């Protein structure tokens, strides 16, 4: 199952 | 044995042809078993393996959402680059991420990753430590300031220890008839004329899982690395893999030459001649 | 920007025997940026209906796919896997080899 993080760059 | 999880995305430019396509798969060790695409019709997330198949609606809702999440902040990521690297918008430009978790035996993490690429170069990186960063260049580097800033890596290490490696854990068992089964190389070594003076050797290894193998030749007990062509190992579209290994041997010499075989699957290394 | 070129692999999913059906596979891999066209042909022509895998990555970074297709083997019918790429001046036609 997947991470729920959102990340920006 | 040991196992992973990873999650692969990628990101594609198209300026003038639409948003940005975003492929992501997901592996259990050279596994496939989920998909997304957000060029299908009615992008979900889907299963590729017949172990998740038994995960229920709210688990393909809740993942379909992440896949979602990730293709938009990926086309803002995609629009920053453009600024971070003073690029035009004309052209097509690529984002890469894998993250996951590998384990031992007994379950526990061994490694944890989270690393980007962009135009198919290093960008940044979790470090091994789940800490701390290394950023490829000065623009990786302002990528690497906000998320100190955020404490993203402790969200980070926090998934990877905890929910990455559960996940796992699960996987292994449902699908233990095939995710904890490997299925070792069917070898046999091939002659192949080329002149009255020498004849390629091929030693095979066909039908195996997972995908890691060691072929090798020797020569009179020696190895014949830089004299050995090696093809990628490659995918033969049933689950498992296939590999060879080719000396170019001089007439007369076929028996001085052995083929050496490691895979898991194998209780011992294989060693094979060429049989006339 | 940096340009990888593929590598080719065209091979079956089982060693061949003239008659019996099988898979003809083109494996492209090692190659940067992603996108690229394949097609198998048999006796030159272009095979309908080929299916592909879903686009992945290396550790590496860079891309491979895999094209398959339904064929059965036989002694006179000929083929190959064509693929274009920014990195190829020309369409590359790797012929298959059922000894490889």
Same mark, same amino acid.
């Given at each position: 199952?997947?991470?729920?993080?959102?990340?920006?760059? | 044995?040991?196992?992973?999880?990873?999650?692969?995305?990628?990101?594609?430019?198209?300026?003038?042809?639409?948003?940005?396509?975003?492929?992501?798969? *997901?592996?259990?060790?050279?596994?496939?078993?989920?998909?997304?695409? /957000?060029?299908?019709?009615?992008?979900?997330?889907?299963?590729?393996?017949?172990?998740?198949?038994?995960?229920?609606?709210?688990?393909?809702?809740?993942?379909?959402?992440?896949?979602?999440?990730?293709?938009?902040?990926?086309?803002?990521?995609?629009?920053?680059?453009?600024?971070?690297? +003073?690029? /035009?918008?004309? *052209?097509?430009?690529?984002?890469? +991420?894998?993250?996951?978790?590998?384990?031992?035996? =007994?379950?526990?993490?061994?490694? *944890?990753?989270?690393?980007?690429?962009?135009?198919?170069?290093?960008?940044?990186?979790? +470090?091994?430590?789940?800490? /701390?960063?290394?950023?490829?260049?000065?623009?990786?580097?302002?990528?690497?300031?906000?998320?100190?800033?955020?404490?993203?890596?402790?969200?980070?290490?926090?998934?990877?220890?905890?929910?990455?490696?559960?996940?796992?854990?699960?996987?292994?068992? +449902?699908?233990?008839?095939?995710?904890?089964?490997? =299925?070792?190389?069917?070898?046999?070594?091939?002659?192949?004329?080329? /002149?009255?003076?020498?004849?390629?050797?091929?030693?095979?290894?066909? *039908?195996?899982?997972?995908?890691?193998?060691?072929?090798?030749?020797?020569?009179?007990?020696?190895?014949?690395?830089? =004299?050995?062509?090696?093809?990628?190992?490659?995918?033969?579209?049933?689950?498992?893999?296939?590999?060879?290994?080719?000396?170019?041997?001089?007439?007369?010499?076929?028996?001085?030459?052995?083929?050496?075989?490691?895979?898991?699957?194998?209780?011992?290394?294989?060693?094979?001649?060429?049989?006339? | 920007?940096?340009?990888?070129?593929?590598?080719?692999?065209?091979?079956?999913?089982?060693?061949?025997?003239?008659?019996?059906?099988?898979?003809?596979?083109?494996?492209?891999?090692?190659?940067?940026?992603?996108?690229?066209?394949?097609?198998?042909?048999?006796?030159?022509?272009?095979?309908?209906?080929?299916?592909?895998?879903?686009?992945?990555?290396?550790?590496?970074?860079?891309?491979?796919?895999?094209?398959?297709?339904?064929?059965?083997?036989?002694?006179?019918?000929?083929?190959?896997?064509?693929?274009?790429?920014?990195?190829?001046?020309?369409?590359?036609?790797?012929?298959?080899?059922?000894?490889?």
């Amino acid at each position: 199952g997947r991470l729920n993080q959102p990340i920006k760059v | 044995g040991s196992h992973s999880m990873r999650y692969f995305h990628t990101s594609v430019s198209r300026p003038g042809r639409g948003e940005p396509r975003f492929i992501t798969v *997901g592996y259990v060790d050279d596994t496939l078993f989920v998909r997304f695409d /957000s060029d299908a019709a009615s992008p979900r997330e889907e299963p590729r393996a017949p172990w998740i198949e038994q995960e229920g609606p709210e688990y393909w809702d809740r993942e379909t959402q992440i896949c979602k999440a990730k293709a938009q902040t990926d086309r803002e990521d995609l629009r920053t680059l453009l600024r971070y690297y +003073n690029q /035009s918008e004309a *052209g097509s430009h690529t984002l890469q +991420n894998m993250y996951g978790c590998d384990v031992g035996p =007994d379950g526990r993490l061994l490694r *944890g990753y989270h690393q980007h690429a962009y135009d198919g170069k290093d960008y940044i990186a979790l +470090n091994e430590d789940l800490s /701390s960063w290394t950023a490829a260049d000065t623009a990786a580097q302002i990528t690497q300031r906000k998320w100190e800033a955020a404490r993203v890596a402790e969200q980070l290490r926090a998934y990877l220890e905890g929910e990455c490696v559960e996940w796992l854990r699960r996987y292994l068992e +449902n699908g233990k008839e095939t995710l904890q089964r490997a =299925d070792p190389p069917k070898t046999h070594v091939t002659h192949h004329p080329i /002149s009255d003076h020498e004849a390629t050797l091929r030693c095979w290894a066909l *039908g195996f899982y997972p995908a890691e193998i060691t072929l090798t030749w020797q020569r009179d007990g020696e190895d014949q690395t830089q =004299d050995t062509e090696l093809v990628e190992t490659r995918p033969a579209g049933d689950r498992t893999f296939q590999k060879w290994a080719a000396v170019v041997v001089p007439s007369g010499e076929e028996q001085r030459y052995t083929c050496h075989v490691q895979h898991e699957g194998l209780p011992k290394p294989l060693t094979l001649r060429w049989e006339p | 920007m940096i340009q990888r070129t593929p590598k080719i692999q065209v091979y079956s999913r089982h060693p061949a025997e003239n008659g019996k059906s099988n898979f003809l596979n083109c494996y492209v891999s090692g190659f940067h940026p992603s996108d690229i066209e394949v097609d198998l042909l048999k006796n030159g022509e272009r095979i309908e209906k080929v299916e592909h895998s879903d686009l992945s990555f290396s550790k590496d970074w860079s891309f491979y796919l895999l094209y398959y297709t339904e064929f059965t083997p036989t002694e006179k019918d000929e083929y190959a896997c064509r693929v274009n790429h920014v990195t190829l001046s020309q369409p590359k036609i790797v012929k298959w080899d059922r000894d490889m």
